[PDB]
Subunit: 114 residues, 3 copies
């Protein structure tokens, strides 16, 4: 799995530990080993949500399987929570796009996961 956060919250406001926390939290949430979890946080963005420049986030979660209606509800509660507590972003100013990737469509280590 891979989790990307783009946000207008400044770099300095991203707490020590946040990548490692995202990694352990997603490894737990997805049931995948942490060695397979990639995390990417992109602060200081020029972005707006609802027309306002108050803190906000645009995020993506890509996984081969482990993506569905109930699972994504449980991801968004987990992830919004972490962004609220760590980054001080309101859950109603967060978007998370979920992608169920086909193994053949994910390359790694000179090949794909097919």
């Amino acid at each position: 799995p891979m989790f990307i956060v783009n946000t207008n919250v400044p770099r300095a406001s991203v707490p020590d530990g946040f990548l490692s926390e995202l990694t352990q939290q997603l490894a737990q949430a997805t049931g995948k080993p942490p060695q397979y979890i990639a995390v990417h946080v992109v602060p200081d963005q020029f972005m707006a949500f609802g027309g306002s420049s108050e803190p906000c986030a645009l995020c993506s979660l890509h996984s081969i399987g482990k993506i569905g209606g109930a699972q994504n509800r449980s991801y968004s509660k987990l992830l919004c929570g972490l962004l609220a507590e760590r980054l001080r972003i309101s859950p109603d100013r967060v978007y998370i796009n979920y992608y169920d990737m086909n193994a053949a469509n994910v390359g790694w280590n000179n090949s794909t996961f097919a």
Copy 2:
């Protein structure tokens, strides 16, 4: 809806009010209220289009529905027009990927849209 623009045009060349203009125009074109509209502009990129580093843009529009042949043609004219007028980018150096998202795959406010 969410609209992202990545461009090699420098930050200083993005005119004031550019995020609010995208938000208003995308509310109108999509039928969604400006409240649900997210916009993200990423200048100063290291990027090439056709092997050339003249001004260019790679862009994404995600929406739950409101994506289709005619609508996308209409979005592209809207949006190339704004990048031409506001950022001095030629329309033939713009790519815009459209994504019709399933409601169960968009997270927001601790839940999903399904």
Copy 3:
């Protein structure tokens, strides 16, 4: 086609000629004129792979067709090889997401490719 590379490798460790090399090798690999190829390299990112901040890359390849099981294995061999030779990133710390885009869903030059 469009190829995006997000990496924590610093800007100064990206060798001169990289975008042109990527454009040339993707033209060859996808069978498409280099005029249609767009390439985007984002260095200096705050990311982790498998909970390590050693060099890593998260990438995407979008193409209208020329996407599939075998083709994507071949892409991954070519693309990992380049990120290992040029950026000194281990192929097992690279992900590349492949997207077969519908022509209706790729905007360009005020319209779409449909």
